[PDB]
Design a protein around this ligand. Structure first.
Ligand code: OPX
Length: 658
C-alpha cells in the first residue's frame, strides 16, 4: 500500500523536529510500519530517532520511541502507564556509523503487527529482533498521545534523549507489511553477507571468519557455523566454507568442510535474557577455529580446525592427555568402550580396534570417517535435536539414525574427552572437501592438543613449506609441513605468558623471514620473528600505537603485494580499544629493509570507535583491493551474545586506508 506520511532530509542537531500536525491525525488502526533511512556518525550516548508521546504533565511514561545507543544498539520502547505496559525491545550491534570515512545510510524497518501481537525490527535488511507479547500495545493506542517527534521524545513538554544525526527519509504505513514486502525495500549497505541465517548451513549464528586468496584468483572463506547461540564449544558447531570468483562481489552457497551429525543442524533463536542466555548445547561434538592454506606444489587447499568430542570445549578438555597412546614411536588413538572406566582400546592400522589388555584385535573397526563398524557392518546412533519448548534447554533423541562416530555421546567406543586438531583437503579449491583426518600429538602422550590459530596458514614463497600457528600454555607451537600436509613437525616458541589465548597470524617479510603477530594478556599485540623459515624464533616484542583489552582479541595480518610510499607493507586488522572489542582498524605498516622493523604509519577506522569489532579476516583480493570479513559486534560482551548476521564483509582499496 501507500504511506500515510512521508518526509525527508531532516537534520537532527540536538534539536527535535515536531511532525505532529503532519502525522498524528493520519494514524489509524492497530498495525503500523515505520521505514526510516538515517545517518548517525556522531551519536549521543542514548538518543531517540522517532517519538510518539503524551507530552502532558503527569504522563511522562506514555510514549513510543525508536532509539539507538552509541554502542550501535537499536531499540524501541512502548509505554502506557494506564495500561500498566512498559515494553523495551532492542538488539546490540545493529547499526553502521561510517564506511570509508563517510556516514552510512541505515535502513530501519519496524513492524508493529496487532494480528500476531509481534514487534519486529530490521536494520539494513537484517532482522534484529522479533518479540511477541501477551497483551499487544498498538503504538498509537498509548493514552493521550499528542506529539510526534523526530530526534527526541517530548516528555512533560521537554526534549528527552536528544539526537545527533539525520533522517534522510521516513515513511509510516497503517499496515504491518509482510516479511516478503520488507525484503523489497531498497538498501544502501556498506557490507555484504557471505554466511547468513537461513542459508545452507542452517546455523543462526557465525563466528571466527577466515579469508584466503587462491592462485586461481578464487577467494575462499571459512567460518564457525554455530548452532547453539554464539557460545564457544561445548556446543554444536560445524566449519563451513564459501568462495568468490569475482573479487568478492558474489559468494557461493556455503558447504561444510567439517561436520558432525550427532545433533541436527537447527536454526534456533537462542534466548538472550539473563536467566537463560548461558544455556549451552552440552552433548554435541563440535569443530571450532578454522584456518586455511594453499599448497602451490600439489595445488591442494588445506583447512585445519579444532575438534571437540561430545560435551567438550577448551574449558573442560583434559589438559593432561593427548588422547593418543605411544607404542614404539607411533601414535594410536585411544578408545573407551561403554562399561569400562578406563581406555582399554586403541585404533591401530587399517582402523582395527585393538584391546590393549589382551593384545588381541576385536571384531570392531573405525572407518575413515571415524565411524564404528562391527564385523564390517555400520553401527548407528539416534540423533538429538534441541528446543526451549519447556522453558529451558532440552536435548533429546529425534528418531533419526546416523552413523556411530567415536566423537559422539552415544557411541559404543569413545575418544578421550580432550581437544584435537583435524585437517581436510580440497582438490577443487573449495567446491568439495575430503573427510577430515586427525593430526598426531605434538607435545607427547600426556598433553592435550594445542589450539589452532584461526585465519590463514602460511605458504612460504621460495619453498614448499607450509606453516600453521597454534598455541598452548607458555608457547606458540608452529606446525610445519614440507610435503603438502602429509606429515607435520612442531617448532615451539616460548612466550612470557601462562595460559594466554595467544592467537597468532604470520607474514613472510622476505624469503625465509617470518613475523608473527599475536594476542596477549597485556593490552598490547606482540610479535616474534623467525629468520630460518620457522625453525627458530626470537624473543617477544610489542607493537605500540594499538591498544587491546586485557583479555585481548584475535589479530589478522597480511603482507601486501604492492609497494606503499615506496616501501613493502604489512596490514593488521584488530580492534583498537582498551574498553571492549570495538573500534576496528586496519593498520598499515611500512617495512624498513635495513632491520625489518615496521613503521605503523596509517590507521584506518572501519567504523566508529564505539561500534563493535572482534575477530577478523583480511586478504588481498586478486585485483589488489582488500577484503575484510569480521565480527561486527563485541564477541566478548555478555550483553551481545547470540546476535545474527553480524559477521560481515567489506571491500576496501589501499587509497581508502591511506
Ligand atoms: O602470497 S600468499 O601467501 O600466497 C597469499 C596470496 N597472494 C596473492 C598475490 C596476488 C594478489 C592477491 C594475493 C597472501 C595470503 O594472505 C593469502 O591470501 C595467500
Amino acid at each position: 500500500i501507500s504511506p500515510i506520511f512521508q518526509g525527508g532530509s531532516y537534520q537532527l542537531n540536538n534539536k527535535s523536529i515536531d511532525i505532529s500536525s503532519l502525522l498524528l491525525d493520519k494514524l489509524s488502526g492497530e498495525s503500523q510500519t515505520v521505514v526510516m533511512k538515517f545517518k548517525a556518525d556522531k551519536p549521543n550516548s542514548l538518543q531517540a530517532l522517532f517519538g510518539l508521546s503524551n507530552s502532558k504533565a503527569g504522563f511522562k511514561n506514555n510514549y513510543f520511541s525508536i532509539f539507538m545507543r552509541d554502542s550501535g544498539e537499536i531499540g524501541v520502547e512502548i509505554r502506557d502507564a494506564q495500561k500498566g505496559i512498559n515494553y523495551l525491545f532492542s538488539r546490540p550491534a545493529s547499526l553502521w556509523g561510517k564506511h570509508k570515512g563517510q556516514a552510512v545510510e541505515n535502513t530501519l524497518v519496524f513492524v508493529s503487527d496487532s494480528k500476531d501481537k509481534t514487534y519486529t525490527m530490521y536494520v539494513n535488511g537484517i532482522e534484529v529482533f522479533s518479540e511477541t507479547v501477551d497483551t499487544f500495545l498498538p503504538i498509537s493506542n498509548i493514552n493521550g498521545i499528542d506529539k510526534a517527534t523526530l530526534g527526541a521524545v517530548n516528555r512533560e513538554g521537554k526534549e528527552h534523549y536528544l539526537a545527533k544525526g539525520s533522517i534522510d527519509e521516513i515513511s509510516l504505513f497503517n499496515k504491518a507489511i509482510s516479511d516478503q514486502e520488507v525484503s523489497t525495500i531498497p538498501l544502501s549497505n556498506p557490507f555484504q553477507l557471505i554466511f547468513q541465517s537461513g542459508d545452507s548451513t542452517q546455523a543462526n549464528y557465525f563466528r571466527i571468519p577466515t579469508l584466503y586468496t587462491l592462485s586461481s584468483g578464487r577467494v575462499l572463506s571459512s567460518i564457525d557455523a554455530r548452532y547453539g547461540g554464539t557460545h564457544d564449544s561445548k556446543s554444536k558447531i560445524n566449519i563451513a566454507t564459501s568462495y568468490s570468483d569475482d573479487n568478492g562481489k558474489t559468494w557461493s552457497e556455503p558447504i561444510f568442510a567439517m561436520k558432525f551429525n550427532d545433533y541436527e543442524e537447527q536454526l534456533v533463536y537462542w534466548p538472550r535474557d539473563n536467566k537463560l542466555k548461558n544455556s549451552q548445547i552440552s552433548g554435541s561434538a563440535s569443530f571450532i577455529d578454522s584456518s586455511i592454506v594453499e599448497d602451490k606444489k600439489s595445488g591442494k587447499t588445506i583447512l585445519l580446525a579444532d575438534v571437540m568430542p561430545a560435551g567438550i570445549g577448551n574449558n573442560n578438555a583434559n589438559k593432561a592427555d593427548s588422547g593418543f597412546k605411544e607404542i614404539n614411536g607411533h601414535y594410536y588413538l585411544k578408545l573407551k568402550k561403554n562399561g569400562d572406566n578406563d581406555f582399554r582400546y586403541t585404533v591401530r592400522e587399517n582402523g582395527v580396534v585393538y584391546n590393549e589388555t589382551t593384545n588381541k584385535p576385536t571384531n570392531y573397526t573405525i572407518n575413515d570417517k571415524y565411524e564404528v563398524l562391527e564385523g564390517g557392518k555400520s553401527l548407528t546412533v539416534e540423533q538429538y535435536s534441541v528446543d526451549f519448548d519447556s522453558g529451558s534447554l532440552r536435548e533429546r533423541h529425534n528418531g533419526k539414525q546416523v552413523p556411530m562416530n567415536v566423537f559422539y555421546k552415544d557411541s559404543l567406543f569413545k575418544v578421550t574427552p580432550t581437544n584435537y586438531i583435524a585437517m581436510t583437503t580440497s582438490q577443487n579449491r573449495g567446491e568439495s572437501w575430503e573427510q577430515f583426518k586427525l593430526l598426531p600429538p605434538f607435545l607427547g602422550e600426556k598433553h592435550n592438543g594445542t589450539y589452532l590459530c584461526p585465519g590463514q596458514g602460511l605458504a612460504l614463497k621460495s619453498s614448499n613449506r607450509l606453516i600453521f600457528a597454534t598455541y598452548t600454555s607458555g608457547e606458540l607451537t608452529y606446525l610445519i609441513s614440507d610435503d603438502s600436509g602429509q606429515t607435520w613437525k612442531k617448532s615451539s616458541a616460548s612466550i612470557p605468558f601462562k595460559n594466554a589465548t595467544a592467537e597468532a597470524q604470520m607474514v613472510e617479510l622476505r624469503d625465509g623471514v617470518i613475523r608473527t603477530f599475536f594476542r596477549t594478556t597485556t593490552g598490547k599485540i606482540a610479535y616474534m620473528t623467525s629468520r630460518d623459515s620457522g625453525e627458530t624464533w626470537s624473543k617477544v616484542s610489542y607493537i605500540d600505537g594499538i591498544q587491546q583489552t586485557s583479555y585481548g582479541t584475535q589479530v589478522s595480518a597480511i603482507k601486501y603485494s604492492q609497494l606503499i610510499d615506496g616501501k613493502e607493507a604489512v596490514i593488521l586488522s584488530t580492534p583498537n580499544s582498551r574498553s571492549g572489542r570495538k573500534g576496528g582498524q586496519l593498520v598499515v605498516g611500512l617495512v624498513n629493509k635495513e632491520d625489518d622493523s615496521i613503521d605503523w604509519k596509517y590507521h584506518y577506522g572501519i567504523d566508529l570507535p564505539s561500534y563493535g569489532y572482534a575477530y577478523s579476516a583480511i586478504t588481498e583480493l586478486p585485483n589488489h583491493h582488500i577484503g575484510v570479513l569480521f565480527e561486527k559486534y563485541d564477541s566478548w560482551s555478555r550483553n551481545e551474545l547470540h546476535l545474527s548476521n553480524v559477521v560481515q564483509y567489506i571491500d576496501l582499496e589501499i587509497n581508502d586506508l591511506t
